[PDB]
Every structure is written in structure tokens, then in C-alpha cells.
């Protein structure tokens, strides 16, 4: 769902809270992938 939202945003990055929401989605993605990696690695 975070991927669908992030690809659903537009191409402009000029607006300040648009940029803020892009950065917040990117940070959530990084933490999400870190979570999945530390679950998957050990088994």
C-alpha cells in the first residue's frame, strides 16, 4: 500500500508539504524494508 500511494503521487516536488509527505513515505519504506530484512535474515 505504501508503494501504491508513493507511485500515485504526481511528478511535481515544488510544494513544501508535498515534499514532506514524500520524505515521510520514503522513511516509512526504509524502516519497513529494514523490519522485513531483520525478520527474513535469521529464519
Amino acid at each position: 500500500e505504501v508503494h501504491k500511494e508513493f507511485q500515485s503521487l504526481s511528478v511535481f516536488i515544488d510544494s513544501i508539504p508535498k515534499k514532506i509527505r514524500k520524505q515521510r513515505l520514503e522513511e516509512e519504506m526504509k524502516q519497513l524494508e529494514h523490519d522485513i530484512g531483520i525478520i527474513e535474515k535469521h529464519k
Partner: peptide, 6 residues
Amino acid sequence: QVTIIP
């Protein structure tokens, strides 16, 4: 070889 998290 195993997992542990706080």
C-alpha cells in the same frame, strides 16, 4: 543461527 529481538 536463530533469531532474538527485544
